Design an enzyme around this catalytic site. Structure first.
Site, PDB file in Angstrom:
ATOM      1  N   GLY A 252       0.770  -1.231   0.000  1.00  0.00           N
ATOM      2  CA  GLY A 252       0.000   0.000   0.000  1.00  0.00           C
ATOM      3  C   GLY A 252       0.804   1.286   0.000  1.00  0.00           C
ATOM      4  O   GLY A 252       0.199   2.364   0.034  1.00  0.00           O
ATOM      5  N   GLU A 300       4.707  -6.477   1.506  1.00  0.00           N
ATOM      6  CA  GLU A 300       4.293  -6.891   0.162  1.00  0.00           C
ATOM      7  C   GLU A 300       4.075  -5.680  -0.750  1.00  0.00           C
ATOM      8  O   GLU A 300       3.006  -5.520  -1.342  1.00  0.00           O
ATOM      9  CB  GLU A 300       3.012  -7.731   0.227  1.00  0.00           C
ATOM     10  N   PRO A 301       5.086  -4.833  -0.932  1.00  0.00           N
ATOM     11  CA  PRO A 301       4.901  -3.665  -1.807  1.00  0.00           C
ATOM     12  C   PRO A 301       4.724  -4.066  -3.264  1.00  0.00           C
ATOM     13  O   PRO A 301       5.403  -4.962  -3.768  1.00  0.00           O
ATOM     14  CB  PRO A 301       6.195  -2.868  -1.614  1.00  0.00           C
ATOM     15  N   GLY A 302       3.816  -3.375  -3.946  1.00  0.00           N
ATOM     16  CA  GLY A 302       3.661  -3.521  -5.387  1.00  0.00           C
ATOM     17  C   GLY A 302       3.931  -2.235  -6.153  1.00  0.00           C
ATOM     18  O   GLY A 302       5.010  -2.060  -6.729  1.00  0.00           O
ATOM     19  N   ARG A 303       2.951  -1.327  -6.153  1.00  0.00           N
ATOM     20  CA  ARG A 303       3.047  -0.083  -6.914  1.00  0.00           C
ATOM     21  C   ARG A 303       4.389   0.618  -6.718  1.00  0.00           C
ATOM     22  O   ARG A 303       4.985   1.114  -7.681  1.00  0.00           O
ATOM     23  CB  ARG A 303       1.893   0.830  -6.505  1.00  0.00           C
ATOM     24  N   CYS A 380     -12.291   3.071 -32.016  1.00  0.00           N
ATOM     25  CA  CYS A 380     -13.577   3.460 -32.594  1.00  0.00           C
ATOM     26  C   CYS A 380     -14.628   3.467 -31.487  1.00  0.00           C
ATOM     27  O   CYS A 380     -15.517   2.613 -31.400  1.00  0.00           O
ATOM     28  CB  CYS A 380     -13.960   2.512 -33.715  1.00  0.00           C
ATOM     29  N   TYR A 415       0.482  -1.648 -12.805  1.00  0.00           N
ATOM     30  CA  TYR A 415      -0.866  -2.063 -13.212  1.00  0.00           C
ATOM     31  C   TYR A 415      -1.200  -1.618 -14.638  1.00  0.00           C
ATOM     32  O   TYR A 415      -2.371  -1.417 -14.988  1.00  0.00           O
ATOM     33  CB  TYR A 415      -1.912  -1.561 -12.197  1.00  0.00           C
TER      34      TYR A 415
END
Lengths: 459, 459
Positions: A252, A300-303, A380, A415
């Site tokens: 987070g 648990e870092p992601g971003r 389109c 992401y």
């Protein structure tokens, strides 16, 4: 004032090329780790993403340094953020571990070289086949999200005669949680879950787990939620007569998507990062040390690992002027439309999650961005234009902007790849990597025509 | 009243199995064109989509019948709606033509058997390579969206020595159009565009084109916009001394996503279809016949052809109860969570466009849907649950619902396949077809592990 917004945006532009660890300018072009991005976009067909291994390393070092005061800290990259094999390889080579969110994510992490004891498997829906694959490969942790799933873990670990290492995920009610959080167990259920696990021959209880959210703009939510997990960990050690291996506090940590903090309020606009990695660690470590200084802390870092470390490059591919006239024929306004060859099928969060990314003309990066324009994609679809502008739905580019120029979206590394689609049968993009020595290579091909019909069964 | 909502929803449930041309019940299970969907979901792994060729035929016949009074009408399926090869084959075999929205969509339509003179190519970004492919294959129409693109069409048609057939797309201002519509030319630019085309040796001007939007809930917008196109077509025939081949009025016919019209307002909730195909044709034909009764009318329906003709089948894969307690320990509410193995990476518009789809327990279709539940997906993402419920974010299922039951989402046939992602590395789904004789076959495989790493370049 529209004047002050334009001035402010061009001050930010000047800061990109004169005071940003990631970027430079050469021959009027934006450079990334010394790589001229106009020239790079002439070697590879647009649109494509370009990642920086140097910036990934910088982000990891920030996180690790933040936890320096707690020696027993393990870092697991949340691979749902980005799982292109070359990006996972860079994260492995930087020395941290991996968190996985499906069976195929576990398998990828193993294939790219993470050992089983470097992988955490999380999920709300882990079917028997998912659990059997995970237990067979001796993962560091499999999280327990529900009582229903625990029955399968017991049965499958007994069948394989292999110990399943687990953490029990608890979601604290920190002022709705029952109604808005699908994940985890109630605090009130933690004790009976742990009691059940302690009676299972091939399941090993390692500690508790939480994850509070994404792009979190203040530190008190991490602190209050961590305290809840810590207080329950302490109480269960006493009641059950055990000593936990670890506590897993999730991810987070936010990333700055707008940089002029003096002009923003992170609580109203979370494109402003409210906190730093150090604020996150300060909250976590202080609460944990009220219980134990020796216990292992898992994060648990992601971003934060990849968000700042990629740019989307896309070519201005068409242009038009539209004009609104009143009933007497006089002009109400001109609208200058610029079309790039990337739309929301390439950059999904720009539409589906109202996400802001800085936009600049990389071919004219030292020129004043002095013209108000609307930026459209190639789909389109009347809705495929970029709505999250500098001022409302309007962006700023040099008035001299020309078809063939390269436009860059900054902070495009989190992401952004696995969320692409083949809507309109436009292909999902190639991906390029700048390695830590400054050299480039392709790490994902652009989808080919064959790729897009090969899943179909037809005569 | 919560009572009246539950009663109303179960009346709708009874209508599905007793008064719907698509569905039946057998052994308590929902059937689709005579196919037991519980049994089908035991043959193929969930989640997967199942399409009905019978319902596609019914929808096409509705559209064609609507235009019976204008003999020279051509129907082009908008393939961005769904382009799985087996679905395109069904639409070809039903006797209509194809509209394409990228180079690869043109190529697919040719491969599955549409002739060049059955294909319209539309787009805002048609690069030289896109135009060269289209002109080389003698397409019925290539639309002209901008003056910039027309330069390329002239140059490339001269190079290939092949005639490019074109329509000029005009977007009428029908009470912002300059600021919100990226597509088409201003009405004021139509004359100079047509004059330019008439001087080109290898470009053939066939008429004008518009497209008003998607899921349009009233008929007056089609009527006013068609009148604008018709009035300009008439004036240009006079001024330029020509006779147009056709007029192309686009798509936008809506599909019912909620059926209890007596309880809805299509102008506030466009899940209620405001109009029918007959209303669309009535608007178009009346305005065109104020000019010519012999001219060809082209239409480009998408959603209406396939929207009602598919179901998403997904297994209840986990369950949990969450409980909120006050400070004294008393219960505030229980929340019953049901987890299915499909999330927003499978059904994208349920999240990104707040789209409603009817949800029923297909394994217990004759049972009262009498329990309020929250329905969640399998993604490791707090936002992956279905928000567009029967009442707020809550759905109705039988209280007896059990892990292993099959849940069905109705009206899942439009914009649901090409919009899937591999987020969390969960695979994009298989697709099954019920053919017009009632037999089933796989028409798209589920993404395999290999499929998901094969685009990557690594050691």
């Amino acid at each position: 004032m529209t004047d002050s917004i334009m001035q402010n945006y061009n001050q930010l532009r000047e800061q990109v090329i004169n005071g940003d660890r990631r970027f430079q300018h050469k021959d009027g072009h934006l450079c990334f780790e010394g790589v001229d991005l106009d020239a790079l976009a002439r070697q590879y067909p647009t649109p494509f993403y370009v990642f920086s291994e140097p910036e990934i390393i910088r982000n990891i070092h920030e996180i690790q340094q933040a936890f320096a005061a707690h020696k027993n800290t393990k870092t697991f990259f949340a691979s749902k953020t980005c799982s292109v094999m070359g990006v996972l390889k860079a994260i492995r080579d930087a020395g941290i571990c991996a968190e996985a969110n499906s069976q195929y994510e576990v398998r990828k992490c193993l294939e790219i070289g993470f050992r089983g004891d470097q992988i955490v498997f999380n999920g709300v829906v882990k079917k028997p086949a998912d659990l059997e694959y995970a237990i067979a490969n001796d993962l560091y942790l499999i999280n327990v999200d529900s009582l229903y799933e625990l029955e399968h873990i017991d049965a499958i670990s007994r069948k394989l005669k292999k110990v399943a290492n687990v953490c029990v995920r608890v979601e604290p009610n920190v002022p709705v949680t029952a109604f808005h959080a699908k994940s985890g167990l109630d605090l009130e259920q933690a004790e009976e879950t742990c009691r059940r696990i302690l009676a299972m021959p091939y399941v090993h209880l390692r500690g508790l787990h939480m994850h509070v959210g994404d792009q979190v703009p203040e530190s008190e939510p991490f602190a209050k939620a961590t305290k809840v997990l810590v207080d329950e960990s302490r109480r269960l050690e006493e009641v059950l007569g055990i000593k936990f291996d670890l506590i897993n506090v999730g991810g987070g940590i936010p990333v700055p998507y707008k940089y002029d903090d003096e002009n923003g309020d992170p609580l109203k606009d979370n494109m402003y990062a409210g906190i730093t990695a150090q604020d996150f660690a300060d909250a976590v470590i202080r609460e944990v040390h009220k219980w134990r200084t020796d216990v292992e802390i898992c994060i648990e870092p992601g971003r934060k690992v990849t968000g700042s470390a990629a740019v989307l490059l896309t070519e201005v591919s068409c242009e038009k002027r539209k004009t609104n006239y009143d009933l007497n024929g006089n002009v109400e306004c001109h609208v200058e439309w610029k079309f790039v060859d990337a739309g929301y099928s390439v950059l999904s969060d720009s539409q589906h999650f109202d996400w802001f990314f800085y936009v600049y003309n990389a071919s004219r990066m030292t020129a004043a961005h002095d013209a108000w324009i609307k930026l459209a994609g190639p789909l389109c679809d009347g809705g495929d234009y970029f709505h999250m502008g500098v001022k409302g739905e309007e962006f700023l580019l040099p008035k001299e902007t020309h078809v063939g120029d390269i436009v860059a979206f900054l902070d495009a590394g989190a992401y952004t790849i696995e969320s692409q689609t083949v809507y309109n049968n436009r292909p999902r993009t190639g991906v390029v990597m700048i390695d830590k020595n400054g050299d480039t290579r392709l790490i994902r091909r652009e989808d080919s025509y064959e790729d897009m019909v090969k899943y179909d069964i037809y005569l």
